[PDB]
Structure 1
């Protein structure tokens, strides 16, 4: 493991610790875990949040939607722990400099955000009950209380057997488009955003019929090739969360 992989590993260990000692990862319990810090909600123009370690206070744009609010929180807690760990903080300072480290730390805040909001356990608990499916994703996203995109990467990172996740939305069965996408450990096939969803494809039917599905099908590679694999489409508020277990 290289520095960026060692740092991320560390940051996960950290989120893991802080979080571990929480009665859940709900926004309110994330707050209680704050070892005496002023958490203030207020309008921050076009800025989701900030963390002020001199005045020991996290600020979270109140304007924004609960989704990003909860995340911007998880994100700024993570930032606080990084500054807490003098090693991860130090090792970092001797490997990156200037904006280069700045980018690295806002990256490690996101790695940690996810570790906080989406416990390894939960992913596996769901990956066990529901397997690697478009519903394992629908459940983790609704259950950790984060976005399909936020839960798209977390779930694909615990999935062993080659699989390809993707969260979908309409163009306007009806015709939909790939928005986010995630490859399991094994997979090297890539399903990028903008890729469209044929009307005959299970997933379309799924979101159209506002009804879950699951059947052998194919990965509708934007390019043109229809690669077969077991799809599980889970529709909901106009998003079709879907899995593509490449055989």
Structure 2
């Protein structure tokens, strides 16, 4: 219900087309088709900046995030390029809502360029709806775990709650859910900052540095333990996990 879904489809079309024109999905190739001045400067904590036409990217953030920022700005330009899509958006949204839709479309396009549906479907085929597949997508696409989490969950055909867990400053430091996403049908969500029990398979994966795949529970902050099969892949001081909700 809404003009966002058809707009997202058009964004993916434009993004996929620009990608095929690119020699590769390498950061340099993306910069090549930017068609605008791009400046990488240190600037505390921020994904990046847009262009009127000068694009800016923080050099303190990890390269993966800079890649997504660049794809976002490419998608923004691609959007402002197609007059039809822009007219459709302006004939449907206005003010903050239009800005939110544009931002969402830019993020939708960025993922379409960096993470192709083929790659995701192939990885889901080889590794299944698992945290290992999440790790593969993030590495094979050189993207942040959070970005891959949303893309992988969107194309999962089974009830799965993917999650990216890592050590956090909490309130001193502990393993917390950094990001979470559910497959199209999942009716649950994992609060960011949720603490991972030390006895939990995800924590064992971080300590052992070995992939852990066992039946466990979703570590809800309510002390509730929803039965689920957990596939945890440890990587870069972060644990990519898959919570397969089981009917029980």
**Where has structure 1 moved over 4 Å in runs of 4 or more?**
44-47
Q: CA deviation at 1:191?
A: 1.1
Query: CA–CA distance in 2 between the matches of 1:168 and 1:94?
Result: 41
- Secondary structure of residue in 2 paired with 1:196: coil
Question: Is the CA contact (8 Å cut-off) linking 1:15 and 1:113 kept in structure 2?
Answer: yes
Query: CA–CA distance in 2 between the matches of 1:42 and 1:185?
Result: 37
- Secondary structure of residue in 2 paired with 1:139: helix
Aligned residue number for residue 31 of structure 1:
31
Query: CA–CA distance in 1 between the matches of 2:43 and 2:194?
Result: 33
Query: CA–CA distance in 2 between the matches of 1:138 and 1:177?
Result: 18
Give the TM-score taking structure 1 as reference length: 0.90
Question: Is the CA contact (8 Å cut-off) linking 2:76 and 2:106 kept in structure 1?
Answer: yes
Q: CA deviation at 1:58?
A: 4.2
Aligned residue number for residue 209 of structure 2:
210
Pair 94,44 (structure 1): closer, same or farther in 2 beyond 3 Å: farther
Among 141, 148, 163, the alignment partner of 1:144 is 141
Post-superposition Cα deviations, 1:108-135, rounded to whole Å, max 9, x if no partner, equal 1111111111111111111111111011
Pair 213,89 (structure 1): closer, same or farther in 2 beyond 3 Å: same
Aligned residue number for residue 183 of structure 2:
184
Post-superposition Cα deviations, 1:59-96, rounded to whole Å, max 9, x if no partner, equal 12353422332121101100111111111100101111
Aligned residue number for residue 124 of structure 1:
121
Q: CA deviation at 1:193?
A: 0.7
Give the TM-score taking structure 2 as reference length: 0.90
Question: Is the CA contact (8 Å cut-off) linking 1:58 and 1:76 kept in structure 2?
Answer: no
Question: Is the CA contact (8 Å cut-off) linking 1:175 and 1:199 kept in structure 2?
Answer: no
Query: CA–CA distance in 1 between the matches of 2:19 and 2:131?
Result: 27
Q: CA deviation at 1:170?
A: 2.3
Query: CA–CA distance in 2 between the matches of 1:71 and 1:209?
Result: 31
Query: CA–CA distance in 1 between the matches of 2:213 and 2:144?
Result: 22
Question: Is the CA contact (8 Å cut-off) linking 1:51 and 1:79 kept in structure 2?
Answer: no
Correspondences of 1:88-167 after superposition (within 5 Å): 88-167=85-164
Question: Is the CA contact (8 Å cut-off) linking 2:43 and 2:58 kept in structure 1?
Answer: no
Does the alignment pair 1:60 with 2:63? no
Pair 4,200 (structure 1): closer, same or farther in 2 beyond 3 Å: same
- Secondary structure of residue in 1 paired with 2:178: strand
Query: CA–CA distance in 2 between the matches of 1:203 and 1:98?
Result: 43
Structure 1: give runs of 5+ residues left out of the alignment. none
Structure 2: give runs of 5+ residues left out of the alignment. none
Post-superposition Cα deviations, 1:196-229, rounded to whole Å, max 9, x if no partner, equal 1111111110111111111111111222211111
Q: How many pairs are equivalent?
A: 240
Aligned residue number for residue 242 of structure 1:
241
